[PDB]
């Protein structure tokens, strides 16, 4: 009977959906995302030439600190039993460490896809929430196209400035103090460049952190990082710096691509011309100085229920999303 809407098919949202399926039903689970596919900042791009040639444009690997294991032990052991995650066994230059690194052999977006199927939720793509209105002690959720929809509960997982862009009753359900806390939330900006080959080969490492370059911050050989043996072609992922990301936010994607491509020649000369390229703009890459109080979630209405979750309330990492999802679930436990 209960109609629950989860806005955002990212890390926080897919886990909220999977956790809601447990500890209940009966309920109807809907997941809406403005993008063509799921993942959010954990997406994996695939080559047009071959769907097997894959590159992680956002998150690279899962860093497990000795605190969040055994705190999130149940989450890690489940993702390892299914083979979704596997320990990192390839070298990555410039990394700092009793930590343990993990990689997703089928691409980092496979984690979200696993949680979405576990939830049994009805997932709808190219579904951008425009307005959230209150009609007869129930929610009326509007989209870019077409007709609006009714729900009993809503969980919002998109970056904080995007929650603030929504029009309707939501703008008046947010108290002045809550609005000030949300406005304090800040994200850095970066550009991602995915390059696809069929060539092969190289360098000894699989990943490399760069601090001396004005445009590039990190370079990864995605196939070697995930340790794909098969002879599929190599895949290169480049993460820009924050100053480059902020300077070129409103610039042409084809112009930005040429800046990073000419910068890759200085870091790594002797590479063939790529078959395919994928440039991804991360306007809200990672949470810088934002909380605003440290809490996992923010409830803005109880009957009917509405909360905001995600990165902006914890930290911009896999365990931050887990803590934010667990906090949202404890908030709706008696609803
Ligand atoms: C370059 C980069 C490197 C990173 N590296 C790491 C790493 O190595 N390890 C690590 O742990 N983490 C890393 N992260 C961060 C990690 O990817 C995130 O912390 C995690 O993705 C947070 O997901 P989320 O669910 O909170 O939000 P998101 O993944 O942002 O999900 C929000 C979703 O909501 C959708 N959406 C937004 N508005 C609407 C709307 N109006 N209607 C419908 N849908 C909407 C968006 O399209 C998006 O899919 C990195 C991120 C970036 C950008």
Swiss-Prot record:
It is found in: Secreted. Keywords: FAD, Flavoprotein, NAD, NADP, Oxidoreductase, Secreted, Signal. It is an enzyme of class 1 (oxidoreductase). Its cofactor is FAD. Pfam families: Amino_oxidase, NAD_binding_8. It catalyses: 1,2-dihydro-beta-NAD + O2 + H(+) = H2O2 + NAD(+); 1,2-dihydro-beta-NADP + O2 + H(+) = H2O2 + NADP(+); 1,6-dihydro-beta-NADP + O2 + H(+) = H2O2 + NADP(+); 1,6-dihydro-beta-NAD + O2 + H(+) = H2O2 + NAD(+). GO terms for biological process: negative regulation of blood pressure; negative regulation of heart rate; response to catecholamine; response to epinephrine; response to ischemia; response to salt. GO terms for molecular function: epinephrine binding; monoamine oxidase activity; NADH binding; oxidoreductase activity, acting on NAD(P)H. InterPro entries: Amino_oxidase, FAD/NAD-bd_sf, RNLS. Secreted into the blood by the kidney. Highly expressed in the kidney, expressed at lower level in heart, skeletal muscle and small intestine. Its plasma concentration is markedly reduced in patients with end-stage renal disease, as compared with healthy subjects. Residues 1-17 form the signal peptide. Its EC number is 1.6.3.5. GO terms for cellular component: extracellular region; extracellular space. Belongs to the renalase family. Catalyzes the oxidation of the less abundant 1,2-dihydro-beta-NAD(P) and 1,6-dihydro-beta-NAD(P) to form beta-NAD(P)(+). The enzyme hormone is secreted by the kidney, and circulates in blood and modulates cardiac function and systemic blood pressure. Lowers blood pressure in vivo by decreasing cardiac contractility and heart rate and preventing a compensatory increase in peripheral vascular tone, suggesting a causal link to the increased plasma catecholamine and heightened cardiovascular risk. This is Renalase. It comes from Homo sapiens.
